[PDB]
Amino acid sequence: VIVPEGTQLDEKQHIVINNGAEPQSFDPHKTEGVPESNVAYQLLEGLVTSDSEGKLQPGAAESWENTPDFKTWTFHLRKDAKWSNGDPVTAHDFVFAWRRLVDPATAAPYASYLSYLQVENAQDIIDGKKKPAELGVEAKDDYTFVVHATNPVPYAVSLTTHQSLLPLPQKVVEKLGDAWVKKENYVGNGAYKLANHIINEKIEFERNPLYWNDKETVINSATFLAIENPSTDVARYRAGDLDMTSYGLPPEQFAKLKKELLGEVYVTRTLGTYSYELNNKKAPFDNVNIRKALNLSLDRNVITDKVLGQGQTPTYVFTPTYIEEGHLIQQPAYSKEPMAQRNEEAIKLLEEAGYSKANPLKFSILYNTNENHKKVAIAAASMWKANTKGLIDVKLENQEWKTYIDSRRAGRYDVARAGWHADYNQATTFGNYFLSNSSNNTAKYANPEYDKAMAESYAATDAEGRAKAYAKAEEILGKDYGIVPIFNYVNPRLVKPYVKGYSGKDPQDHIYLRNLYIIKH
């Protein structure tokens, strides 16, 4: 079906992909990162999923509908679908999983996601005011899952593809608790299952023969590596020891790779933003004047054009303006000023705040170990010092992925490298991040006026109305200088010519093993 007729498939169907890092966990309620979701998506499947191009297709639900007010969403589940142990997949598994996500005892980084979906009582449950059993989702019968939202959410179906809303095997998780995720215990309803896991080395997948659509799955087995540095990823690729890199390539090699690996270099325009997150509750970044100074004195074009140069585009706002309903978001006025005037203003703000050459503003940029992030951090450190004539002095601090994520969530940072990739292709996937009460808000940004502009979007009756509310939200966030946005992502990857089913056109750049195949010639 996924294979064109008369294509000679290879016999083995094994693929090696760089996943870039050791995942925190294989439990989708305990994680918040791309490495983790890459794994979850092979082992579990939600109501709806996506093809090679990011278009929505039926997953665990074969059909669905909404009421005309966009508040009630009914999902019809496959009557024959099974967990990998033979248990039936039922609407009870979705009720169970979605309760578990909001349940304060789970402490889920993505607890807020069902508040984004406006599910009745989701926010109350997160806030400890109602029991998880009061969540507005139900099994009308074994194969009918109904979601009740308090406000219109016309983009609801695209939200349901996220890792946080994957079903869990209730009978298993209720018996084993959090231990369900161990390799010996794991049960899922995705195309693959866990064959092996060696920490910091590899995750091995094998076909889940009890997947509802196993008959269309081509790849028999796969390995995910955990290679942190893009240069290492490329070296393993060129030695023929992996088939697909992760989504970063060494800038200094990019030009030569395009020439030598004709048709292997893919660059996806993705719905992502690279930022430095400022800790808004830690002195001295609690001071708006300092947040503003850092924004004025970082030249984004240096990073996008000189350090990276792979098609990344400078930005000064969090939301990518090309996401659906993002088109009214305005780049701020200062982005249009000469660096000379910006730098003048930044020096003024820092002197007013008591810094000088002899007593500069000192802080560390926290980033996850990755030579490309180091390069960007060195250039940022270097620009901030030169552009403010010695009034900023920046140290670099690298931590492994898992530690880095813990440090950010725990607020044990000054400034942290941050990339946000869209959870669904609509502007609120970015706007919702900076709500005062969002579990994703590691910046500790809180402005009631931001929350109010975002709340106005649900009173809108159409896209223009929504788009106008998101424009006002971004304006407020921008005037507060809540973070330092740098660029919108492209996702450069090398993919071997015998690997098929990777499009280069998915704006979330997901890789599902079930979408790939290995050709013979």
What is the C-alpha to C-alpha distance for residues 255 and 253, in angstroms, rounded to an integer? Answer: 6
CA atoms within 13 A on the CB side of 116: 30
d(CA 68, CA 455): 20
Buried b (16+ CB within 10 A) or exposed e, 87-103: bbbbbbbbbbbbbbbbb
Tokens of 449: 């006026």
**Dihedral pair phi/psi, residue 69, rounded to 5°:** -85, 0
Please identify, among 114, 137, 169, the residue that sits at the C-terminal boundary of a domain: 169
Verify that 93 and 146 share a domain, yes or no: yes
Inter-CA distances, 146 with 134, 135, 136, Å: 14, 11, 8
CATH number at residue 147: 3.90.76.10
Q: Structure tokens of 253?
A: 């090699």
Looking at the structure, tell me whether residues 96 and 163 fall in a common domain: yes
d(CA 392, CA 247): 31
CATH of the domain at 187: 3.40.190.10
Q: What is the b/e burial string over 239-278, where b = at least 16 CB atoms within 10 angstroms of the residue's CB?
A: eeebbbbbbbbbbeebeebbeebeebbbbbbbbbbbbbbb
Where are the alpha helices (H) located in 188-304, listed in sequence order? Answer: 230-238, 251-260, 288-296, 300-301
Query: Which tokens go with 368?
Result: 């996850």
Q: Do 123 and 146 lie in a common domain?
A: yes
Question: How many Å separate Cα 395 from the centre of its chain?
Answer: 27
Report the domain count for the chain.
3
The Cα–Cα gap between 471 and 253 comes to 38
Q: Indicate if the alpha-carbon torsion angle 31, 36, 38, 40 is positive or negative.
A: negative
Angle at 404 between CA 98 and CA 396, to 5 degrees: 155
The answer to whether residues 39 and 50 belong to one domain is no
- How many residues does the structure list for the chain? 521
Q: Give the domain-ending residue among 145, 169, 193.
A: 169
- Please calculate the CA angle 33-34-38 and round it to the nearest 5 degrees: 125
Q: How far apart are CA 183 and CA 195, in angstroms?
A: 8
CB 361 within 8 A of CB 290: yes
DSSP state letters, 444-464: ----HHHHHHHHHGGG-SSHH
Tell the residue number behind the tokens 């390799």, with chain if given.
183
Query: 150 phi and psi, to 5 degrees?
Result: -90, -20
CA 235/CA 398 separation, integer angstroms: 22
Distances (CA, A) of 364 to 79, 141, 281, 415, 485: 54, 54, 16, 6, 17
Question: Tokens 């400890």 identify what position?
Answer: 128
Specify the 3-state DSSP secondary structure of 486.
strand
CA 509 from centre of chain: 10
Backbone angles phi, psi at 105, to 5 degrees: -65, -25
Nearest in space to 13 (alpha carbons), one of 169, 199, 211, 243: 243
In this structure, are strands 313-314 and 483-494 parallel, antiparallel, or unpaired? antiparallel
Which helix (H) or strand (E) segment holds residue 65: the answer is strand 61-66
Same domain (yes/no): 342, 448? yes
> Do 335 and 407 share a domain, yes or no?
yes
Separation of alpha carbons 389 and 304, rounded Å: 23
**Which residues, other chains included, contact 323 with Cβ-Cβ below 8 Å and sequence gap of 6+?**
271, 422, 425, 426, 427, 429, 430
Here the tokens at position 115 are 């508040």
Answer whether 334's CB lies under 8 Å from 300's CB.
no
Residue 372, classed as helix, strand or coil, is helix
Q: Let me know how many helices (H) and strands (E) the chain has, helices first.
A: 16, 18
CB count in 10 Å sphere of residue 236: 17
**Closest Cα to residue 414, out of 454, 457, 362, 449?**
362
What's the reported resolution, in angstroms, to a tenth? 2.0
Map 373-424 to HEC letters.
HHHHHHHHHHHHHHHCCCCEEEEEEEECHHHHHHHHHCCCCCEEEEEEECCC
Residue 342 sits in the same domain as residue 265: no
Are β-strands 14-18 and 221-225 bridged in parallel, bridged antiparallel, or unpaired?
A: parallel
- Compute CA distances 123 → 31, 113, 341, 354, whole Å: 19, 10, 45, 42
Contact assessment for residue 300 and residue 317, using Cβ atoms and an 8 Å cutoff: no
Which one, of 140, 99, 142, lies nearest residue 121 by Cα? 99
- Which CATH number covers residue 392? 3.10.105.10
Listed residue (149, 110, 114, 139) closest to 30, CA to CA: 110
275 phi and psi angles, rounded to 5 deg: -135, 160
Are 3 and 95 found together in one domain?
no
- Identify whether the C-beta of residue 2 lies closer than 8 Å to the C-beta of residue 503: no
The method of structure determination was X-ray
Omega before residue 360 within 30° of 0, cis: no
C-beta of residue 222 within 8 angstroms of C-beta of residue 204:
yes
Spatial distance between the Cα atoms of 96 and 87, rounded to a whole number of angstroms: 15
DSSP state of 89: P
Q: Are 385 and 355 in contact (CB under 8 A)?
A: no
Cα dihedral across residues 157, 194, 230, 218: positive or negative: negative
165 shares its domain with 177? no
Give CA 292 to chain center in angstroms: 26
- Amino acid at the residue 155: Y
* Residue 228 · residue 370 · CB < 8 Å: yes
The 10 Å Cβ neighbour count of residue 362 is 12
Q: What are phi and psi of 109, to 5 degrees?
A: -55, -30
CA distance 113 to 78: 25
Do 140 and 65 reside in the same domain of the chain? Answer: yes
Longest dimension (CA), the chain: 72
Indicate whether 197 and 105 sit together in one domain.
Answer: no
Are 253 and 230 spatial neighbours (Cβ–Cβ below 8 Å)? no
Nearest CA to 311 out of 509, 54, 488, 502 is that of 488
54 and 35 fall within a common domain = no
Sign of the alpha-carbon dihedral angle for 400, 401, 406, 412: positive
Contact between 519 and 7 (Cβ < 8 Å) = yes
Q: At which of 169, 195, 221 does a domain end?
A: 169
Domain that includes residue 237, residue range: 1-44+170-271+491-521
